[PDB]
């Protein structure tokens, strides 16, 4: 709206804020990519000073001796407020502190919630009641997990989207590599180019693979409460499926592209277990290092955990551009390669031919997302109906897994996954 | 037409016949890919016996002790006739010998002319006058060089196509690797698939590269009388250009596809020197082996030879599907890699994106060509009008090179070629 912005890191004492948020905002400030009149205000329960945050986080800054002066400037633009997350007086203190800044009463306010969603219901309330700007815009950045299933995610999203408009909500997702946004971009451009030929007449099968060669790196405790379907598939792989199967948008507006994405999502039926192959990785005896340890050998993983580290799922877009064309989402950890690609196999009319869009592996994709929040571009942020459709697609399966607890097929650290995945792929027609 | 075939190797005493024709026909016979009643009759001036040809050529057969009996069968189906190439009595002796074979009077006759084209005018005459079958078909296989320019090639082709119909002429080309026919096949299938999007609206530039890492291997004497444009470009690279830029054929008939190829060729104007970059490779001082020797260090190359071992040429198809779209044919020997690929760059409407068809590097492509001659498929054999159009496109440039003798830019053994080639590519718009 104007020239003055306030970046409010809710929960600045956190681990995400220490290791990623503060270093990323510092890199954006140093490279001159933030607005010139930007203030950063941390807010949390820990009674901290800006010097405490500096000591905690500057090790992660890439702080070189040549950059001292603008680093001191950046930290001069920092302040911190201690307060509770459901205390109205604390939020009033925060609002007064923000108003006391230079043109803080007219400044745009970017709240970013480096907090567990368990407190979101409180925070989003108090903000909406005490800290929104009357003149500049107000944009909120929420973090994963966007709920756990259709029900919890609807509860959280209906609460948040009862206090803020959709163009104020930014559901950020940025944990799958520094090339994510660019991968989605090349897939959208490929959809624009190859659109006229991506039909059920030419295409016989599409895959989307997300491959990782390392395991949970002794962090399986956090991964255990989510699973590989929640971690990679119902958010990222499904979103590139949308980008592949979508119709041409009405324009280049972010909301038109997201409209076409949700229009695709509303054509996918609810996946069932007979189209799913789950898998868990075991230690490799002949390997060395972390390859000798399996998933259950992780000390943070509870004994008897049946959560999958590998998933192969078959979906179907049910319109008359794609009908009976199987979309095979295959992803997993502790595999043979670090690969992310989409490949479309054609109908042989003459072996079978494929078109392969390989994806990686300047603004590092996470810096690009913060910059997009600053600019107002919502294209790489999932919409409420988009998220609801994803959860609707994947919720009955997840409920069945949580209820019946089936053992997912074992596969060795460094393999390609269980052979049953290949059997399913070839049963739905893959060659 | 029936079950009996006679394979007449004109000039069986030759080097091509010893090193390639006889071993290939033996491999086709051993694998059971020839017709069951097939005879092989060599014909040449050297007064030889079948045992002489056996001793000469079996070293190249991959003759294993397990294959002795069918090898003896194959050689039992061989005979040889000594005669002159313009002696009517010798051709009458050959015709009588062929008639004396089992059902030779009704057999199909496949004449394949392992001779320098300098004698073709004689041979093709006498055959047409003395050795054609009255019942079975008669098919002729002619070898490179199909002339030298528009004039010599028209003379030779008008002579040959005054005695045989087009479906009896097979201009074979098979010296660029064992994957040629399959490369052309995948390019045709890519034309069928990506047709609707290969326009001047989406495409901004096409390249076609033929790259070789080794030099003339001390055989520059033969290469010197032709050049890299005659060796690779006016035959193979131009033909895949045709396969890329062509319209959809009326059917899958070989003649419809060749019709579309010649329809494309008749839209390319005559290339001029300001769109051409020629180059010659020199020895690499820091390398080892044949990389230390250049082109002129080849003892078979005449001193002062200005023939190019590298060429970068820009062509334009001039219809309204492609208009102003530059087709950049880039090829050369003694480079950094063994690559053959086509790549099409799209118009950036958002860096620039490309669609890459990489080409290699069962029936080895040369065996496939002999089998196609046996079957009557002429699709991988250039037609008379196709060859005339290629020569018309490239003849004024070749005449200018032969007349003015410009020095082609020097490039080091193992490089990518002269930088002037990149300058030209980027001047016509390549990024
Ligand atoms: N792969 C992923 O999906 C992934 C990875 C990393 C982070 N995240 C998300 O990013 C956000 C930031 O996570 P984080 O690693 O920074 O979390 P964190 O370690 O929990 O701490 C962030 C701050 O939240 C406050 N806090 C934590 N638990 C609380 C509780 N139960 N009640 C009240 N306040 C509490 C603390 O501040 P005070 O004690 O000073 O109040 C803490 O410093 C979370 O929403 C997390 O889900 C997701
Ligand atoms: N890269 C290429 O383009 C390439 C490579 C290899 C071959 N070729 C073509 O393949 C064909 C076969 O070549 P090749 O290597 O086998 O040739 P070759 O070494 O010349 O011999 C083939 C036979 O032709 C006869 N002959 C040769 N020169 C003659 C002449 N001046 N007058 C009359 N008869 C003559 C000889 O048989 P007799 O003495 O018993 O009569 C000789 O054994 C040629 O047309 C050649 O151009 C092309």
């Amino acid at each position: 709206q104007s020239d003055t912005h306030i970046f409010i890191i809710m929960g600045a004492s956190g681990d995400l804020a220490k290791k990623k948020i503060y270093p990323t905002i510092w890199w954006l400030f140093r490279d001159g990519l933030l607005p010139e009149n930007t203030f950063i205000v941390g807010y949390a329960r820990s009674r901290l000073t800006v010097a405490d945050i500096r000591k905690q986080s500057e090790p992660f800054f890439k702080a070189t001796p040549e950059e001292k002066l603008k680093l001191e400037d950046f930290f001069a633009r920092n302040s911190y407020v201690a307060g509770q997350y459901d205390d109205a007086a604390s939020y009033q203190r925060l609002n007064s502190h923000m108003n006391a800044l230079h043109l803080g009463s007219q400044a745009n306010r970017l709240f970013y919630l480096a907090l567990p969603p368990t407190v979101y219901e409180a925070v989003t309330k108090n903000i909406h009641e005490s800290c929104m700007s009357q003149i500049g815009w107000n944009r909120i950045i929420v973090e994963k997990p966007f709920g756990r299933d259709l029900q919890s995610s609807d509860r959280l999203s209906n609460h948040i989207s009862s206090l803020f408009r959709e163009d104020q909500i930014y559901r950020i997702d940025h944990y799958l590599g520094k090339e994510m946004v660019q991968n989605l971009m090349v897939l959208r451009f490929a959809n624009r180019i190859f659109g006229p030929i991506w039909n059920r007449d030419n295409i016989a099968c599409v895959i989307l693979t997300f491959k990782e060669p390392f395991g949970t790196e002794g962090r399986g405790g956090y991964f255990d409460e989510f699973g590989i379907i929640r971690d990679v598939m119902q958010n990222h792989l499904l979103q590139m499926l949308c980008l592949v199967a979508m119709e041409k948008p009405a324009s280049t507006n972010s909301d038109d592209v997201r409209d076409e994405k949700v229009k695709v999502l509303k054509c996918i039926s609810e996946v069932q277990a007979n189209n799913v192959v789950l898998g868990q990785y075991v230690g490799n005896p002949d390997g060395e290092g972390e390859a000798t340890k399996g998933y259950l050998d992780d000390p943070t993983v509870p004994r008897g955990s049946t959560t999958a580290t590998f998933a192969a799922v078959v979906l179907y877009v049910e319109n008359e551009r794609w009908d009976g064309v199987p979309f095979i989402l295959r992803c997993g950890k502790a595999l043979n390669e670090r690969k992310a690609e989409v490949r479309l196999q054609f109908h042989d009319v003459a072996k079978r031919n494929e078109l392969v869009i390989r994806l990686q592996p300047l603004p590092d994709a996470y810096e690009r997302l913060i910059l997009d929040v600053f600019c107002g571009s919502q294209m790489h942020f999932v919409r409420s109906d988009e998220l609801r459709e994803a959860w609707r697609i994947f919720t009955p399966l997840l409920h069945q897994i949580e209820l019946e607890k089936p053992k997912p097929i074992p596969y060795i650290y460094g393999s390609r996954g269980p052979t049953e995945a290949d059997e399913l792929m070839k049963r739905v027609g893959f060659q």
Side-chain angles (χ1 to χ4, degrees), chain A:
Chain A
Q1 209 267 340
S2 71
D3 265 332
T4 310
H5 300 65
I6 311 184
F7 198 63
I8 311 96
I9 312 181
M10 311 283 316
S13 63
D15 191 73
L16 183 70
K18 168 160 66 37
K19 282 177 192 171
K20 207 161 176 175
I21 301 177
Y22 272 116
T24 299
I25 201 71
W26 149 245
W27 297 325
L28 283 180
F29 173 85
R30 151 201 92 196
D31 297 338
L33 291 153
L34 299 177
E36 206 190 19
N37 301 311
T38 302
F39 295 93
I40 301 106
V41 181
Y43 178 88
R45 293 171 308 166
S46 301
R47 311 226 191 160
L48 295 170
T49 68
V50 185
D52 295 327
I53 275 173
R54 179 160 174 173
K55 182 186 74 66
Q56 273 182 352
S57 171
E58 198 183 328
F60 309 91
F61 275 5
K62 172 223 291 172
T64 73
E66 72 173 44
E67 279 150 4
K68 175 184 158 87
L69 195 150
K70 63 173 74 177
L71 173 136
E72 299 280 359
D73 182 1
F74 168 83
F75 274 117
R77 318 201 84 111
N78 283 109
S79 49
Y80 182 90
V81 180
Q84 312 292 324
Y85 299 114
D86 212 335
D87 198 297
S90 307
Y91 285 88
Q92 273 153 15
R93 274 189 286 121
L94 172 63
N95 180 75
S96 315
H97 171 79
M98 288 197 271
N99 283 337
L101 297 169
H102 179 79
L103 288 195
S105 43
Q106 302 137 67
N108 301 308
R109 298 185 177 201
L110 204 167
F111 300 87
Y112 167 50
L113 307 180
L115 304 154
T118 59
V119 310
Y120 276 11
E121 267 197 11
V123 175
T124 60
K125 169 189 136 55
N126 276 285
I127 296 191
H128 167 91
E129 183 178 280
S130 302
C131 314
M132 280 197 291
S133 166
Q134 302 167 2
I135 296 143
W137 44 253
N138 302 277
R139 290 166 189 165
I140 315 299
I141 303 185
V142 307
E143 283 266 346
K144 282 175 65 176
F146 312 140
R148 192 179 179 84
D149 48 33
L150 186 50
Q151 299 67 18
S152 46
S153 179
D154 283 330
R155 201 203 155 168
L156 186 41
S157 187
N158 290 353
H159 174 83
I160 288 178
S161 59
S162 80
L163 309 165
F164 310 86
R165 300 180 261 96
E166 191 61 38
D167 58 346
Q168 315 193 288
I169 312 186
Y170 285 76
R171 308 202 172 74
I172 199 161
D173 194 338
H174 58 95
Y175 301 99
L176 294 181
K178 48 173 211 301
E179 311 104 353
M180 296 180 65
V181 176
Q182 208 185 31
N183 292 345
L184 305 175
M185 283 200 259
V186 304
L187 278 163
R188 179 169 55 110
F189 292 160
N191 175 272
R192 179 171 56 89
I193 292 177
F194 298 105
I197 68 170
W198 281 3
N199 312 121
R200 55 183 307 279
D201 302 309
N202 303 79
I203 306 305
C205 177
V206 185
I207 76 167
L208 306 93
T209 51
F210 198 80
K211 292 175 73 172
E212 250 164 305
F214 47 78
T216 47
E217 301 303 340
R219 306 198 44 73
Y222 187 32
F223 179 85
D224 192 66
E225 316 286 334
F226 286 145
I228 195 66
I229 293 187
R230 291 190 190 88
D231 187 39
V232 166
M233 187 169 309
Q234 82 96 33
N235 48 302
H236 201 234
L237 276 192
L238 192 45
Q239 187 153 329
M240 39 184 59
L241 191 165
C242 299
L243 283 176
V244 166
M246 47 168 307
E247 307 288 325
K248 193 194 173 235
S251 73
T252 71
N253 290 334
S254 64
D255 277 326
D256 277 303
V257 192
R258 296 203 282 177
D259 277 341
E260 298 303 326
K261 290 166 88 154
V262 56
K263 200 182 300 167
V264 168
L265 275 184
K266 285 181 280 196
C267 294
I268 297 173
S269 282
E270 323 190 338
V271 60
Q272 313 197 273
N274 50 76
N275 278 336
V276 183
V277 168
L278 304 167
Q280 196 175 66
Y281 78 90
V282 302
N284 180 223
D286 304 338
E288 56 92 15
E290 292 266 2
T292 71
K293 316 275 147 169
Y295 180 65
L296 293 86
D297 300 359
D298 195 333
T300 52
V301 170
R303 171 186 280 168
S305 192
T306 71
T307 66
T309 67
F310 169 93
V313 176
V314 190
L315 302 185
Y316 296 91
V317 177
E318 286 172 16
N319 45 19
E320 45 194 11
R321 184 181 155 165
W322 322 81
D323 209 18
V325 188
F327 290 75
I328 285 149
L329 304 153
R330 201 180 149 124
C331 72
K333 291 189 189 301
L335 295 177
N336 51 344
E337 61 183 358
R338 179 79 175 92
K339 190 174 80 182
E341 67 166 40
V342 177
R343 90 173 42 212
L344 304 92
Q345 315 209 301
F346 291 105
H347 276 126
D348 182 283
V349 194
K351 301 172 187 49
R352 210 194 282 201
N353 313 99
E354 311 160 335
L355 169 65
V356 171
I357 313 176
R358 201 218 181 211
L359 311 171
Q360 297 289 301
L362 210 74
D364 195 282
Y366 180 52
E367 308 157 24
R368 179 74 253 160
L369 280 190
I370 306 292
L371 287 169
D372 275 343
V373 178
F374 268 91
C375 280
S377 187
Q378 289 194 294
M379 182 170 309
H380 309 295
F381 299 85
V382 71
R383 223 163 60 185
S384 301
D385 46 354
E386 202 179 336
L387 175 66
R388 184 175 196 211
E389 291 301 324
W391 277 126
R392 168 198 68 82
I393 291 163
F394 277 101
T395 288
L397 176 77
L398 291 164
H399 278 187
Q400 199 200 22
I401 313 179
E402 297 172 351
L403 175 57
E404 307 188 4
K405 282 192 72 71
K407 197 275 179 188
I409 303 301
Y411 68 96
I412 306 100
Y413 199 114
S415 162
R416 300 176 34 249
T419 79
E420 292 84 341
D422 297 291
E423 298 178 17
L424 162 74
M425 288 192 57
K426 292 186 281 182
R427 177 178 82 71
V428 288
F430 162 73
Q431 292 308 126

